[PDB]
Amino acid sequence: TIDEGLYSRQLYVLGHEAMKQMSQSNVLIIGCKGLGVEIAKNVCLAGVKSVTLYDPQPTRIEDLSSQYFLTEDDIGVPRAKVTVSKLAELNQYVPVSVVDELSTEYLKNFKCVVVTETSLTKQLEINDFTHKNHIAYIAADSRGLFGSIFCDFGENFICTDTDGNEPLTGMIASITDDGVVTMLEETRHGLENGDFVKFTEVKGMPGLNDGTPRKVEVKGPYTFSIGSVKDLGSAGYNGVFTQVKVPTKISFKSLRESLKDPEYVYPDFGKMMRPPQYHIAFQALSAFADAHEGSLPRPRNDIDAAEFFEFCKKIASTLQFDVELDEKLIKEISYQARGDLVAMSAFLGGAVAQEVLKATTSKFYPLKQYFYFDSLESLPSSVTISEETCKPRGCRYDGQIAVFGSEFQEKIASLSTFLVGAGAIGCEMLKNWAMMGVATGESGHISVTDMDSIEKSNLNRQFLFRPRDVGKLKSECASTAVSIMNPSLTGKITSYQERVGPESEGIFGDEFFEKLSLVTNALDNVEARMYVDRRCVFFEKPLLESGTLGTKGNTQVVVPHLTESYGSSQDPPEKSFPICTLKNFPNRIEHTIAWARDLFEGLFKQPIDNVNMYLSSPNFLETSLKTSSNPREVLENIRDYLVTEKPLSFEECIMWARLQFDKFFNNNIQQLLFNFPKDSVTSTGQPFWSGPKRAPTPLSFDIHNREHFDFIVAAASLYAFNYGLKSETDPAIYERVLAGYNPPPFAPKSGIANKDKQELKSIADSLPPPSSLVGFRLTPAEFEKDDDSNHHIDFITAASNLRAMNYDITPADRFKTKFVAGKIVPAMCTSTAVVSGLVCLELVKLVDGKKKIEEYKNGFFNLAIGLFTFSDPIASPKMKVNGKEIDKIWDRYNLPDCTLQELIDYFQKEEGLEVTMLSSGVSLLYANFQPPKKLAERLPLKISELVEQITKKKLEPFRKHLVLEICCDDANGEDVEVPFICIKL
Amino acid sequence: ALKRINRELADLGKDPPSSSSAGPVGDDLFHWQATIMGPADSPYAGGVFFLSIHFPTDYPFKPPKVNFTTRIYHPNINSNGSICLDILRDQWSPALTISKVLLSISSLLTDPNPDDPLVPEIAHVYKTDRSRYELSAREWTRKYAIG
Ligand SMILES: Nc1ncnc2c1ncn2[C@@H]1O[C@H](COP(=O)(O)OP(=O)(O)OP(=O)(O)O)[C@@H](O)[C@H]1O
Ligand SMILES: [Mg+2]
Ligand SMILES: [Mg+2]
Fold first, then answer.
1. Residue located nearest, by CA, to atom 11 of ligand 1
2. CB atoms within 10 A of CB A810
């Protein structure tokens, strides 16, 4: 009963069973500050059964530093009572409640218990109960730029999936008598030692087809070992192996037991001596709060730091921790005890929400057990951070002023950022900017652009949008929502509806891009990322890239003249199957899905486009007869869709669908088996239909069968949609119409001048003239995966499964068909929160203008295994030009709009280089090998005039520069790379 | 991108391909028209075949789109000009030059691969009735590939 219209992207990460088990779990959340509200939001968007909140503390002003469901009108009201109403709107399937008082036995009502903003004594009291009653217990804490997570799921936690990866499967070439299983040519199984596999469709060793998992002993990248198969047989030929995943038993320890001997998780390997320090420091914080009526150390206060360090010494002595305490780091923890940052809150909230989902669904490998994190590299160094600057000012930014100071707050308030995209990461980034106070000053401004509209499936991870906002523009809704969150951003946010690309340079030009301070990408495709990266490189602006894929995520920072750009890195490209594999010899469901998509496009889209273009373009036939690859195909499509096979009623559509069934699933297979019989052999004597080639078999139309009827219904409905007829769904009419069908005879044909032009002319003159058909247009079918009533995925699924039945491939359901055909990217709210937190932690480094490259950190993480890693950015490569140091990426030549000859002379005389190629955009302006007449005609023209002449397009009035790529040779003839040229028009 | 394309173009200019001639269309660096001469020891002897090469924006990180323009009677080449070359679909790596692609296509024309065909009828004719395949190939290369 999962609402797949809303959880579409999340089901591809978790699954149906995981979400079914998740929708029966109760979560209690103690503490409703920024971290607690982030956890509650992520849990509500995830889809647990219910959420209960407990926070009777009255609201204060500083709480607004990271609580985005609190307004200044709520001062003096308990935080839970004012957060429940706003949390109840995120998801309609997840009720949210509030408890005035919490008793121990009450905890038995819940499946998971999350604890924040609670003293250590109360945490021990809660955990002593939630441990022996088998209740998952997560405790999270956030102090300044430091964070801690602790997980305790019981002594007998069962983890079904330990990495989140799909089970490994592959094809076998041969299995020897000693269990040595070999993969096909250039195919790597990818198995690791200790895995279990099950074999199917094995020839010569039927015993391995029983299904019993067997051990794996990897022997190489292509072969492995399974043990002894002597009894079953001597040798096995071909077959498919599939990995088997076995549940694991994980044993946790209680908080009281794990205080003395903790088990750490290291988010970074460059600093592995710190977690032992943080373990003492946080306990000392709890003791200090207990000894001062719950008052944490004052910001940048030396007396409190000294007392806190004395508490740390006492704790380290009591626990017999044989670790020397780092005074500077501990005192730093003391200074930022009252800090409350939205970036740290978002990061830890995403992590803790993922831990909650692990506890409820018994999936993925959890943290075990202590996770201590810090981003101390973000602390500003170009401003004064002392007791005087960090004291609270009685404003909503107190939690951030207590870490960064008032001067850095004024630096933040004057930012002029540019956010590209308004998806999930865009919404999180806008929330973080609103909470941090970005662009709330006189000179601040925010610009957000996105050309898409809100859909139902987007509401599962984009929390700024509501079901009443479905169908509206993302940028406007996001700007309005974040102006609601922070009233000071009224009039400081501008929302566009423009796609960032070559066509939008009239809006995002020099004037727009020269006032910015940084650019943040929230895109989902590589082309736009590359374009924005090139624009930032040209204008020399800092860039923040961030990406997610299911539970994986990464963040990268590009700094002018310091690090390399985004395009300097290469990612694994997409895999496209060979045309010969798709056309005739498929062996996986992906091949059949691709074939079905091509069939859909070629049946309902291309012929309609040709018909429409014929009835509109007056001279279309002449152009097609000498331009299109197959003019005969175009003419046949036009004839068939205009006169020959034009339906007058839906019954004719049904008959057409039956005919297409015969055409594509019964006759082409007969032709293929006539060309290559099942008993044919290759040139080397081996049987043809062996290995990656599976012998097909024609399908006979059986109306009672489900797949045949589904294909008929989908095809007839789509044809009627093309011709604008009235579709129906009652099986009675289909069974009545298809009963009286006589299949036309078909026999495969063995084969055995300028008359073809005569036949083409005869076909052409048979077509109706455009004048006789005025206003008659056929509606094409534009692929749309997200609508379930257009019969698109239904048709693709039916065709794919029928072709699988042809080749005895295992058919897939509509869920997997929609995942594969639609190129859906799995997405989660927790990953979005984590990447937004990391990006906003890098943003404060960018604001402070840090110069050293070791102070920035590109981040990568995988939440399925609890892996976090941070690495320094790659420095921009240097080069030697004319005995001078030149940055490859961030250097350019500035020249006037001089003639081509003057440009060549300047390069010859100044740089001592001989120009051999000069191009602009995609055009070759000048080449050393061109005939002399062309050069003599082109040399004395200005660069702008030359570009206008060659590109056959006048320069737009808003064009103010030209980017030229130049390749030149040295005096000796050796090639030398040089930066691009920036001609100033 | 542009620099690599121009380097390949200059290399073709510096060293003649003899059996091929590739160059940009008009003044566009991302659209080339190449010419291939039929091998002497093949039915396509004395023929000129025109190929259209479309360089993707992500070149050389994505394969160029090479499509025949002249009609050819070959088991691995269909009626739309698509070529069954492994180095152009998923084996592509940013280390292959256009001269290598043209040499591979010439070798493909030298001897087809009927065990993994793209046009099953032509492959069947080639495997069973060789003389008819030769006659059809000569007829096609005389009707389309000449003049
Ligand atoms: N070139 C571009 N210029 C501006 N905005 C862009 C560009 N390309 C993509 N976007 C926007 O980036 C955002 C990407 O967010 P996201 O991928 O989460 O949403 P979606 O693609 O609509 O959803 P889904 O992928 O889940 O179906 C979308 O708003 C999309 O409109
Ligand atoms: Mg969308
Ligand atoms: Mg998307």
1. A421
2. 11
